[PDB]
Amino acid sequence: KDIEISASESKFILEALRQNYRLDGRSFDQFRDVEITFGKEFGDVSVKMGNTKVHCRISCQIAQPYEDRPFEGLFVISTEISPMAGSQFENGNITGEDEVLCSRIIEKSVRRSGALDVEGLCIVAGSKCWAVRADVHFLDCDGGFIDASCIAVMAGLMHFKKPDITVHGEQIIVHPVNEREPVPLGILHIPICVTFSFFNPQDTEENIKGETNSEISIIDATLKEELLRDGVLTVTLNKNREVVQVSKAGGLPMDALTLMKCCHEAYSIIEKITDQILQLLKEDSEKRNKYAAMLTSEN
């Protein structure tokens, strides 16, 4: 399972960056357009950026909490790749490296960051809590998965609602779904990750001892773009201007002064897209309630 590209094609794109061109039609520092569409279920969404397609799912159920944090509920994200999304991939390799490179990000992007209040999953302390689940599916790759799965999970959390609960010791009263309403969830902050994609037009030494910074960085590598890149970097931020994570794990060497200059441009990008989610969550729920207005008057 190996992608084969000519070195002639390798120089071609490398030339295009040397004349400030890229094959998609975007700018270097331009991001794709995002299509968000929900299914009928809560925590159901289809997210699409041109060629890359994803789908995720949020659910929850009853379990006991750990001994470790006996206060808090349970939550984890599955991101199992299927070779459906591209023939590179093993059947569910949870031990591949790029998978881990997809994993630990979303592990830190959600779980260690804590966008979601796990303490608001405590139904009863130590007895019964929530087990909230996030199964990420990939559909078709043009890269940006780890940015797409960044979004589509956080999209899904802002669309899921959990049903109604009443406690009497052991008499724990899960109510019928349609009499007593499902209840949405508590998001502390909304993180958005950004892939950065790096291209030395030169050898090693002109990056190493060539003092002249000459390295091109772009956003959202397409599939062919992604196969030649030299370093890998993802930052994540919010609306309140705090930096969630940064991960440059090796690759090409890279100036620090670039990275701050990189990460500022992230901010203006992610903010506009964030609010686009925020209206569409409202507007769909508005469309839910206008169709709820088109239901009770109908019934």
Partner: protein, 223 residues
């Protein structure tokens, strides 16, 4: 007949199809023929490996059998001698349940066959015939039989049934049965009655389908 389908909706994959029946959304993908692994080849026929992802949870044993019965059905659909020492990985995604996965697996088994049949048409591989599957239930309390039930009707269903047929000569002749998944309580007598609608209905399904294929693909075809 609140069914509907899409062809050719992935990019890097040979065959792709979204099958949408009344409540369940399922997409299937087909990549083949491609390079087989070492432990996987056959000297004569075509090797097939099939992956079904659920909507919820991960791949476990509940998935495994729905895979494996679906292995049995495709094997005569494929002109298997045409691709020696080769491999076609086929992959299915359950996106919507439309049925209680804890209690049932019925509709998905009807759905995924009806899903994977069309992505092979996208794939354009040497095949043999035409096919269809429907879910059929018999109500516990009413003791009547519904073709294409719902999950609440499944709760009051006594017995759940999936029929897979092989259709030829304009898809009209039942060439063979592929799968009959009899589950729940049943007798002799219901069963020949249980075929006898699905004798018609799957052809009535394919009668819709024959149109749909050409409508999607003749503009993809050139004149």
């Amino acid at each position: 007949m609140s069914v509907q389908a899409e062809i050719g909706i992935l990019d890097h994959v040979d065959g792709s199809s979204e099958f949408v029946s009344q409540d369940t959304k399922v997409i299937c993908s087909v990549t083949g023929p491609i390079e087989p692994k070492a432990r996987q080849e056959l000297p004569t026929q075509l090797a097939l490996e099939i992956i079904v992802r659920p909507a919820k949870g991960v791949a476990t044993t509940r998935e495994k059998v729905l895979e494996d019965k679906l292995r049995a059905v495709l094997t005569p659909l494929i002109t298997r001698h045409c691709y020696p020492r080769q491999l076609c990985q086929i992959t299915c995604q359950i996106l919507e349940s439309g049925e209680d996965e804890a209690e049932f697996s019925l509709r998905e088994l009807s759905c995924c066959i009806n899903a994977a049949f069309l992505a092979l048409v996208d794939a354009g591989i040497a095949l043999n015939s035409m096919c269809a599957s429907i879910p059929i239930a018999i109500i516990k309390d009413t003791s009547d039989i519904i073709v294409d039930p719902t999950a609440e009707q499944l709760k009051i269903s006594l017995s759940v049934h999936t029929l897979a047929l092989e259709f030829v000569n304009g898809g009209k002749v039942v060439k063979n049965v592929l799968l009959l998944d009899s589950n729940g309580d049943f007798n002799e007598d219901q069963l020949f009655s249980l075929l006898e609608l699905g004798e018609q209905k799957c052809q009535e399904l394919v009668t819709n389908i024959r149109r749909i294929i050409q409508d999607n693909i003749s503009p993809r075809l050139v004149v």
